[PDB]
Each structure stands twice: as structure tokens, then as C-alpha cells.
Predict the structure.
Amino acid sequence: SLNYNLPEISKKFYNLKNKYSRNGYGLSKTEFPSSIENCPSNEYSIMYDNKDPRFLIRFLLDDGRYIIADRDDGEVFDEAPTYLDNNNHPIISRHYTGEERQKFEQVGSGDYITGEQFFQFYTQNKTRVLSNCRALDSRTILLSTAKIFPIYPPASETQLTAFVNSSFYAAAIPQLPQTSLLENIPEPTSLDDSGVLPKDAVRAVKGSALLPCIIVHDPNLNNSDKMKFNTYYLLEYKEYWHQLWSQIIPAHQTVKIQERTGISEVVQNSMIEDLNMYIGADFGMLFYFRSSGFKEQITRGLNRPLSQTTTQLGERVEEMEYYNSNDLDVRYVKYALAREFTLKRVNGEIVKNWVAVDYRLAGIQSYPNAPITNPLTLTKHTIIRCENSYDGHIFKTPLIFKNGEVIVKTNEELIPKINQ
Amino acid sequence: NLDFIDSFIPTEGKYIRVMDFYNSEYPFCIHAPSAPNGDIMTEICSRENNQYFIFFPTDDGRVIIANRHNGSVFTGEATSVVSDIYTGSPLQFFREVKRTMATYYLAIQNPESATDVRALEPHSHELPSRLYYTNNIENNSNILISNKEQIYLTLPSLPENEQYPKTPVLSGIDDIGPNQSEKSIIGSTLIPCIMVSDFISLGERMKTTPYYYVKHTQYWQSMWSALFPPGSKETKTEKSGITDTSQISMTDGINVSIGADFGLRFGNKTFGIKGGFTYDTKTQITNTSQLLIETTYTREYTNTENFPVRYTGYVLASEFTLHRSDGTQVNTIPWVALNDNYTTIARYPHFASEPLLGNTKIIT
């Protein structure tokens, strides 16, 4: 641990060869046209030859199906809606879109006991199967056919569908970082100590996920280099204490302090642009079409749950009033739990960072500390600006923010009341 | 408790809850029937296990809503929701959609036509009522539910994952080596009590051990040991696969089977948790419809050294055990799978070469 639990075929660019071919034919990227009469080829066709082999990775989806992607051009397999002879669809190369026509199911068959097993590729819920066009040992194209024949007697037509693994290139996979513990809320050392700024706060690693480059939008690389050298991107999840304010509160006075939490809209759109992911109002992960196929594996690695709301997390502006009950001036600093996501390349370079400040877990520290001074007291709470009513509740005042303790909003009395 | 700051706001399957509808005039709580079958009602609130529920999560976020009295689950029927035994039916999977921080509605998806989503709703706020369906979701507060009570669960402790086991070392030419190496812990997963079989009644499971857990270990299993003369070739017997008795016990125990490709196959009850099950135990879902069977191989091993060498063959073993929340092991039949494609040969002296693999046969 950490262990993303990727299958072996999801970590290698395998050369796929036909099991029953006697001259070493397989899936190829040769530029020469098909040699068979009723098997026309073009620039996009998936070729079948014994020279110039393809090396393909299978990105595992949540439902168990795979995305077959090429190591050289970075494109994926696609079942085109075009019809050939005998009502067949050609298999072409195309950029990844997440459509159903790019998902393929692998089914293993044969004699596992003798090591002579093979596998097939099916589409449209086992109604079509990928097959060589007529030829076993000739340059031809790959297609899908609704003519499915029994497997227990490897019929002549079934032999055009049997694939095995051969040579491979290792995919570029970054190492998962080890988790660490979250520190306590930093204590100020003096009256002039303004506290720990976010650029200096110590972060704790809480999760990480491996992202297929097909769903990652990186402008600094091309699709070819992004497939060979960054086959999987690293997405870390970190936590740190994000300072909300730091101020000297005079003796026996009440001050009005603004508290800004949540996440900005431009930061949300940034994460949507690069990853097709964003944060929900419940601080859960929400996904869009390009990346929704892997959302369950990503969340299990990140240790962040799927969001149970359709409301997008936004900016939250709240005005608080605190009262210092001591007869001296005290430095008070308040921190809220920040949830940080970092996308890194295989070599470790950071692509972007996205931070959301969780106002539900916050605490206060002070100098002088206990037992010299008494804890700060929250005496008023007003929500100033927020673009959604997912959490339109305030703390029931008064409320004492003891030094060091984390005030969990869902464990306090709120207005209007909840958990009723 | 800063080490567990992410447990202060827990997921939906970490606590027992008491539910009520938001705009109810009188204190009405959701009530499950005392019989294993019957209609779900909103009765007046009281401290009875018929009004206590646990949301068991699944891979896609949906939940299975079981009551603490008998363990029956929410079952979506024709016009109202009933409480039936859990069988993995699609009518028993619901989705909690949080409209706000404290209000939510429960949605059932018709197995036919996935665009037909209906929310649970009563037909009265002043009298007891069954739970009906409705397609009026937007700006409809009649479907909103509030958790009247939340009691957190004490989940069982899970052991720490250990690194993969290494091959045992021989201390001499007369040392046959241990029968088994150390059983390394690979992973553990929490499985709801309604998906396993046990002599404890479901009603008692929901009270004392609402979550079971499966432990996945790996170790080296000894197959043969001999002192090979120099230049001699011997034939040794090696077993692979899983026995038919173990295959059936695991299938009846946790509704999981081992395919021919050493991947796991899930039945109707555990199909919705196969993602978390495999991820936690570091296993894979099978891609073949064939089951793993017991097979006996014979392999030729030749000592190509000038001197006698002691050899001991080991096969990688994969074991699964079912445990209750108190740690007790449930299955009395071992759930072990041997993979002859992963072998190591302990040798003495240590600097000797590996024996030359000759030909392999299969005994029926």
C-alpha cells in the first residue's frame, strides 16, 4: 500500500497475435493496403499483418470492459457505424471520446490447464465479436460481426477471433506516495506571530490515483509522448490547515471578521478542463462524460467518496463576530481543513493544483495559550454571499472555540435545526 | 483524534439511522414490518428496531436499506415499497440524493428503461402511510427525508497488510524446509452481513455484527523435497487449482467463486460490491465463464550439478477466510487456491543452480 490494483494487461502495451495463425500474424499498423478482395482498408483501418506490430494497452473501466489504446499515435479502437459486406462494422483508429463504440469486453476461453487458452473481444453486450476479415495468414482488416459461432469446438470462423499476448512494452506508471498523518493546529509563538500561511503549511498525504492519459488534458506534451512516457498520471489528495484569519483581539472587545471558504468557480472550471472532475457541495467528487467511466476506481484510490449531490461547490462568504473575554490583548488565528488535489507527471512535475477549503472542520489557536487566556467565543454568525442553499445554516450562538479542538459543524446546534 | 479527522463526517454506511419525512405534522418515523415480508409504513416514533436502518453502500454509490429487527431490506414493488429478504434483486438498490446538507430523497431506478427514476414519498403527513413512488422531483419537498437519529457503529479492526512472502531457506542438505511459509496478509474487505451465510440469524447479525470481513492471505505451500544425485532426473507431483469442496463452500459462504483464470466471480448478492471487494483484497474479476478445478501435474526436474543438491518445491497459495466482527472465523472448510504457474525451489547449497525443468504431464 498504496496499491491501485491495476491488472497486468492495464500496465503493458501488448502485441496481440492470432492463436491459430501459422506465420505470426497479428494486429499491425502497416501502411500497405489489405490483400483480400472484400476487405477494403483506409488510413483509419486496424490492419492485420505479420510485420510492423502494434502494441496496445487496455485501460480498465469500472464495469470491467476495456479501452484499447495504441502506444505510438495514442488513439483508441473504435467500432465505426459504417457497414461492410455481410453487415459488418470496421474497427478504426480514433481519438478517445468515452462513447460506447470505444468500449470492448474481453472473454477468456480454451484450455487453461495446458496453457493453451485465448481471449476474444465482444461489443454491444456480447452481440458482436471482433474477427479477422476472411484471412488467417494474409494482410487484412479487423471488423466486428454478428456471426458468433460455438467456442467449445474452435470452428474455422471462430479461429479468426482468437487472440493471445506476445511481446510488450511496459507502461509508464508513477509510484504511489505513502500516506502521512495530519498535524495539529499550529500555535502562534508571540503577539507578532501571524501564523502559518498556506504556502508553508505541512501537508498530509491521504490518497492517490492513477489516471489514464486519455482523460488528462496536458498541453505541454503531444499525444504520442503522453502515451509512452506518461501512460498514467498521478493524482494525489492532501490535507493541510488553511489559515482563515490572524488578528490581535483587544481585551473585552467584539470584532467582526470575514471568513472565506469553499472553492472558486475558475478553479472548478480548471479542474473540469484538465480532468473532467469537480467538487460537489458535500465535498465529494463529481465527474463528466470523458472520465465517468473510471470514477469508482479513482475515488477508491483517492479515499474521497463519490458526491451524493448535484450542487457544485462554490464560494462561501461568512461574517463572524468573536468576543475575547480576557483582560489582555490576545493573538488569535483560525484554520480550516483544506482538501488539496495535485496532478503530477511520471517524472514528478506538478501540472496543476486545486484546493477547496472545508469550513466544516475548523479550529482556533492563540498566544498566550491556555491556561493563561480563556477560549475565544463565537457570538454571531451571518452568511453574506453564497450561490447555493445546500448549507444555509449558521452556528447557534454563543459557541466557544477552545484552543486546538476542531469544531465539526455537523456536530453542533445549527439554525435552522437539523438531524430532527 | 486528529489521526481520524475524516471520520467526524462519516459515510452513509458507518451509522444506524432513524428516518422521518421533513414536512410531517406529527412525529412519524419510518417503520419496517416485524414479519420478514410486509409493507413499509410511517408509524409514530418509538425505540424499536423496526425503525432503525443501516445503508450498506455498493460500488456505484447506491445503498441497500436493511432494518435492525430482522435484516430485511427495502424492496420496490408495483406501487409501494415492501420489506423482503435480500436476494440481490435490482428492486432492492436505492440511491440517496442529498438535496441539501440535511435533507435527501431516496430514488429507485426501474430495471426496464433507465430514464425512469422515481422517489419514495408518503401520501399523508397526519396519518400512517405506505411509501409510494413519484416522478415529481424538482422543487418537491414531500420526498425529503431527515435523519432523526444517528448512532455510529464500532467496526471490527482490520489487520495491517504485510509484504509478499519470500521463499523459505534451507539450513542443510537434510533440511526439507517448512511445510508452509508465513501467511502474508494481502488485504481485507468489509462485507455486509446480509450477503453471507451463517448459523446466526440475520436479526442477530444486524445487532452484534452488521459487517463481516474477508481476509486475503498468501503463502508458499510445500509440494516435494528430495536430495537429487548429480546428473539425475526425477519426476515430482505438483497440485494446482482448487478442490470442488472448497469451491462450493466459498460459493455458499460469501457468494464468490474462483474462475479458471484465477479471477473472482460474484453471484447475485455480491455483484454490486465487486469493485470494493477486489480493490481491498488486491484481486481481479474473472474474464472467463469457466471455473477453477483441481489438477495434478507431474514435472521432470534434473540436477545439472557435479554434486548432490537438496531441492524443495513450493507453490504459491491464495487463501480467503470469513470472519465475524468479534474475529471468529466462519468457514470450517479452507478456501485455498494453488497456482502451479508460480513456483519457487528452495535449494541447498544456496549457490547451486535451479533444476532443469523437463516435460510435464497431467494426471486425471
About this structure: The first helix of chain A runs from residue 223 to 228.
